[PDB]
């Protein structure tokens, strides 16, 4: 019944399904350490994951999939989804990443954790890229839904074609948004391409992030929730 939705109805559904902006458990009474910093990010991500799951259920076409398929897509894309959310709310904050309203960090604070400043620079560059393109909120929720449906689709048939139909619908929706915004036909396929090519960079950042999240766990820096453990243990592996 997602394929019966119009573009505006796709947008409205996605906008209404948006998760809230959570706060971090940041304690300013004590200085930052690698552990304390990693503890804040871990705790925050864990709480965001619960909201992500309920958001995913409100993404058109997602509940049509089997539980095994829903688990796979979320396992594959969860960090990508967290990251695009991070770069989105960091747009109006040049040189900074807004993990939470009470957790706004620059790259020098990212040096507190080994190997994190590299990802932070990438995240900053992506946020700047979005700012330069003047990414709209309607466009953002489309991109985030594409990531959820696409990232794990090649690692699956019957409902594999279903996903691609929903993905084509979101494509139709994006173009519709750009047309309504007054962009020329040529500008529409150029902007579509630009936004989607950015998803490749988001995949890249996620892979690099996941890789270091193994090592942090394998060096016992901070306790990870059982959920977060299982999400990490889907990637996970394999070297």
């Amino acid at each position: 019944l997602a394929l019966s939705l119009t573009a505006d109805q796709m947008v409205s559904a996605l906008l209404d399904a948006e998760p809230p902006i959570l706060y971090s458990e940041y304690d300013p009474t004590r200085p930052f350490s690698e552990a304390s910093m990693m503890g804040l990010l871990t705790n925050l991500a864990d709480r965001e994951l619960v909201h992500m799951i309920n958001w995913a259920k409100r993404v058109p076409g997602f509940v049509d999939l089997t539980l095994h398929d829903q688990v796979h897509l979320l396992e594959c894309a969860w960090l990508e989804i967290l990251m695009i959310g991070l770069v989105w709310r960091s747009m109006e904050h040049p040189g900074k990443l807004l993990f939470a309203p009470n957790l706004l960090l620059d790259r020098n604070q990212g040096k507190c954790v080994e190997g994190m400043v590299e990802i932070f620079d990438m995240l900053l560059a992506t946020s700047s890229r979005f700012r330069m393109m003047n990414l709209q909120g309607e466009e953002f929720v489309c991109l985030k839904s594409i990531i959820l449906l696409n990232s794990g689709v090649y690692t699956f048939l019957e409902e594999k074609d279903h996903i691609h139909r929903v993905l084509d619908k979101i494509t139709d929706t994006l173009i519709h948004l750009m047309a309504k915004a007054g962009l020329t036909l040529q500008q529409q396929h150029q902007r579509l391409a630009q936004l989607l090519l950015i998803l490749s960079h988001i995949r890249h950042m996620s892979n690099k992030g996941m890789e270091h999240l193994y090592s942090m766990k394998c060096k016992n820096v901070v306790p990870l929730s059982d959920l977060l453990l299982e999400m990490l243990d889907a990637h996970r592996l394999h070297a």
């Binding site: 619960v50 799951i53 259920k57 539980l67 829903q70 688990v71 979320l74 396992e75 059982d226 959920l227 299982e230 999400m231």
Partner: peptide, 9 residues
């Protein structure tokens, strides 16, 4: 599988 459980609740 915790994710599995959460997708049901």
């Amino acid at each position: 599988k915790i994710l599995h459980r959460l997708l049901q609740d």
